[PDB]
Amino acid sequence: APQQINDIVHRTITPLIEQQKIPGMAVAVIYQGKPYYFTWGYADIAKKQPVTQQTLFELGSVSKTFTGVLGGDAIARGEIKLSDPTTKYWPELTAKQWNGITLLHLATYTAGGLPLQVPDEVKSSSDLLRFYQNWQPAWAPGTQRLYANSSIGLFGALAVKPSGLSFEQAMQTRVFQPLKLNHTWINVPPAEEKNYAWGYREGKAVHVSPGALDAEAYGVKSTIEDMARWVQSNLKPLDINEKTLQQGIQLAQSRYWQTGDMYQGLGWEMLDWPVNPDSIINGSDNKIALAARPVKAITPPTPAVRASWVHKTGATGGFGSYVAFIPEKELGIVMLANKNYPNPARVDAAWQILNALQ
Amino acid sequence: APQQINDIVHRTITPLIEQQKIPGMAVAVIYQGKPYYFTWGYADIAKKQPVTQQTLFELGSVSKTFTGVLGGDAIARGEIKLSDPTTKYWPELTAKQWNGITLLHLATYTAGGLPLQVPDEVKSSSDLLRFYQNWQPAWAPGTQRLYANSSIGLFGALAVKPSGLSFEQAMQTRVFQPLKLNHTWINVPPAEEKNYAWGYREGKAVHVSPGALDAEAYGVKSTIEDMARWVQSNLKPLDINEKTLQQGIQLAQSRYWQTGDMYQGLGWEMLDWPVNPDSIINGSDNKIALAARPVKAITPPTPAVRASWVHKTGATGGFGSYVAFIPEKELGIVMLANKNYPNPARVDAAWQILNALQ
Numbered sequence: 178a179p180q181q182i183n184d185i186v187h188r189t190i191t192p193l194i195e196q197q198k199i200p201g202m203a204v205a206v207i208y209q210g211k212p213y214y215f216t217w218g219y220a221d222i223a224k225k226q227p228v229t230q231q232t233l234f235e236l237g238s239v240s241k242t243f244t245g246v247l248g249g250d251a252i253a254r255g256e257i258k259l260s261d262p263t264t265k266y267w268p269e270l271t272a273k274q275w276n277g278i279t280l281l282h283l284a285t286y287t288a289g290g291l292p293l294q295v296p297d298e299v300k301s302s303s304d305l306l307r308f309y310q311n312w313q314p315a316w317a318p319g320t321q322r323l324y325a326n327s328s329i330g331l332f333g334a335l336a337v338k339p340s341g342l343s344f345e346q347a348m349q350t351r352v353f354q355p356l357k358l359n360h361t362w363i364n365v366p367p368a369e370e371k372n373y374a375w376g377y378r379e380g381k382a383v384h385v386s387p388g389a390l391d392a393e394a395y396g397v398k399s400t401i402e403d404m405a406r407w408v409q410s411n412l413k414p415l416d417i418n419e420k421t422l423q424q425g426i427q428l429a430q431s432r433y434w435q436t437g438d439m440y441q442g443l444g445w446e447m448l449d450w451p452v453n454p455d456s457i458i459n460g461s462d463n464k465i466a467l468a469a470r471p472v473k474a475i476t477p478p479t480p481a482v483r484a485s486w487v488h489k490t491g492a493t494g495g496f497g498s499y500v501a502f503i504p505e506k507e508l509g510i511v512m513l514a515n516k517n518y519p520n521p522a523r524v525d526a527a528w529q530i531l532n533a534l535q
Numbered sequence: 536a537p538q539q540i541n542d543i544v545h546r547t548i549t550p551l552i553e554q555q556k557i558p559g560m561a562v563a564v565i566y567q568g569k570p571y572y573f574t575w576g577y578a579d580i581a582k583k584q585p586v587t588q589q590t591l592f593e594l595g596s597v598s599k600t601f602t603g604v605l606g607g608d609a610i611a612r613g614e615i616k617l618s619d620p621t622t623k624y625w626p627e628l629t630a631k632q633w634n635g636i637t638l639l640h641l642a643t644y645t646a647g648g649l650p651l652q653v654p655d656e657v658k659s660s661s662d663l664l665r666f667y668q669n670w671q672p673a674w675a676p677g678t679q680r681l682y683a684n685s686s687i688g689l690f691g692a693l694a695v696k697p698s699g700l701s702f703e704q705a706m707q708t709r710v711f712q713p714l715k716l717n718h719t720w721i722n723v724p725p726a727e728e729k730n731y732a733w734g735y736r737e738g739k740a741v742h743v744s745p746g747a748l749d750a751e752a753y754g755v756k757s758t759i760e761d762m763a764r765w766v767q768s769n770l771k772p773l774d775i776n777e778k779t780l781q782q783g784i785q786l787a788q789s790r791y792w793q794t795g796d797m798y799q800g801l802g803w804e805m806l807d808w809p810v811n812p813d814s815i816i817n818g819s820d821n822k823i824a825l826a827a828r829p830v831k832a833i834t835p836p837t838p839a840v841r842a843s844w845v846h847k848t849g850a851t852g853g854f855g856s857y858v859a860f861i862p863e864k865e866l867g868i869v870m871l872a873n874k875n876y877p878n879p880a881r882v883d884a885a886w887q888i889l890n891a892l893q
């Protein structure tokens with residue numbers, strides 16, 4: 178790749194891998210619409226297996242971007258409406274507090290305080306219904322944003338209801354295949370187990386644990402090659418053949434709510450570019466990222482803005498991921514590590530690199 | 536054209552012209568994407584000039600659809616947001632009532648009672664400011680719909696402001712040229728006057744008179760061939776090369792408000808397909824079409840629904856037009872006459888014709 182790209186990346190990431198003590202890392206820089214890959218360390222320290230272009234990484238919450246786009250596609254297909262009441266897709270969700278909660282609230286974390294996590298005890302479908310039936314809101318819908326798996330996860334599950342397909346099958350056929358993401362999985366199959374990296378937390382090797390709505394909120398595993406494609410597709414959706422997916426990617430980057438200098442899309446979060454580095458860096462700290470924040474409705478939603486810094490952090494017990502891109506500059510980056518390290522460290526590194534290239 | 540199309544068309548239009556005493560008429564049916572033309576009578580009864588595929592007709596309010604799409608292209612360009620307050624584009628608009636009135640309210644007739652017509656006495660730019668400064672809302676914005684030229688017209692004037700172009704130039708440059716609408720004009724040039732049909736009001740030959748915001752609200756003149764191209768462009772916008780125009784068209788067919796079983800877009804009006812003929816035919820009568828009706832906001836707006844009956848009526852002193860199409864079926868029709876006759880009569884004819892073709 179151009180000396181330029183090589184230079185910043187080495188100077189930025191290599192030291193970061195050292196300071197954070199990251200076992201393995203794959204980085205893809207999309208420059209002028211083209212990807213360049215960088216690789217470091219092991220995918221498995223025990224077997225001294227290295228990180229390659231085919232190593233599978235748990236994306237954590239970056240999965241939410243897939244869920245948001247699957248949702249956008251279902252809307253363009255005419256199968257769902259964001260203005261539709263929740264109970265319209267789950268008739269048993271009868272409790273009165275669910276009355277004015279629509280799919281939009283579920284998708285953007287503005288339903289009124291649904292919890293970040295679905296309790297570990299909730300397992301059966303029964304457990305899930307009872308949990309939602311008993312939930313008491315902390316705020317009226319549409320007033321506060323509270324980042325949560327239990328909100329977007331339910332959105333994913335109801336969004337695929339009309340299609341009659343399971344969440345995984347709707348995702349593979351409607352999103353993975355058309356984009357040719359031939360190595361992205363919710364449930365990695367036998368054949369891919371050997372490329373599936375171990376996550377590392379406290380020197381021990383881990384893989385994400387099953388849980389309710391895990392697939393809908395954080396269950397995707399992928400490679401830097403597919404992820405790079407994922408970023409190219411999101412950078413230039415008009416280049417996408419399938420009509421509903423092209424429109425879905427756009428709906429996913431529309432601005433529905435604003436809080437501070439951030440805008441909430443479906444899965445994706447956006448900021449006007451140029452961006453204030455302190456802002457995105459500090460804002461990514463979990464003290465802030467996980468707190469409730471009042472939101473201002475954007476009426477009507479602003480369609481996908483080219484001059485945006487679009488991004489999403491993800492993490493699981495032993496994995497730390499990050500994606501960011503600026504459509505207007507055909508610039509984007511993907512960072513996958515088999516170690517969960519500080520969000521501010523990822524965002525800073527990404528900002529150094531991208532700011533350097535335009 | 537196929538005898539099927541030819542037969543339905545003549546069976547339906549012939550008695551209509553007879554019944555209504557329409558001097559001349561042009562009709563185009565878009566079947567499976569291809570257009571088919573039909574013409575009858577005179578463009579100029581005095582000089583016995585026949586109506587042809589080159590005859591120019593005044594579109595009347597059908598012009599609001601062009602204005603809506605021009606607005607949408609400007610949103611797609613990032614030059615304006617429908618969520619912005621009117622005063623962000625007209626600072627001199629100091630009156631307090633203008634506080635929470637957005638571009639969306641203006642584009643959809645929900646500002647709070649803006650009048651149907653701008654008074655004839657309003658001629659100067661200053662005259663327009665005064666008129667708007669002294670206007671007193673009847674209702675809160677976003678609560679009632681009142682069809683108005685003073686509302687959508689102001690929207691068109693403000694939407695082109697950032698661009699630095701005049702309304703006619705932005706329209707030619709951003710909508711007409713790209714779609715190859717080469718015989719569509721706001722001001723018909725001397726070279727084209729010979730094709731400009733006369734309108735007929737109680738036996739007298741008339742052309743539309745100038746008025747404040749006429750260009751923006753009812754100023755376009757076109758031919759049956761360009762209108763067919765206009766219909767095809769709106770039926771399949773994803774076939775448009777221009778990125779922002781293709782987006783603009785989709786934004787104009789999105790659903791922002793609902794009233795009865797009608798949905799309001801930017802210029803365009805829609806109903807779910809299949810549709811009750813009487814649901815349209817009746818709702819069309821100028822008495823029912825311009826009255827005060829409360830609206831329900833669609834939050835967030837539903838993207839262009841393929842299964843809809845999309846249409847718009849238009850009339851000037853001597854002209855009556857109608858446009859209707861069903862994307863899902865790639866079917867549409869355009870009817871241009873140099874006589875302003877009953878709206879229900881147009882809708883009835885259009886329905887007979889399209890219903891007969893699937």
Ligand SMILES: *[B]([O])([O])C1=[C]C2=C([C]=[C][C]=[C]2)S1
Nearest residue numbers: 237238294395490491492493
């Ligand atoms: B994402 O990586 O921000 C996630 C946050 C949590 C997940 C699962 C369980 C609890 C928090 S995925």
Ligand SMILES: *[B]([O])([O])C1=[C]C2=C([C]=[C][C]=[C]2)S1
Nearest residue numbers: 595596652753848849850851
């Ligand atoms: B459209 O054809 O419905 C129109 C309605 C009016 C126009 C001009 C002046 C007053 C009403 S165009």
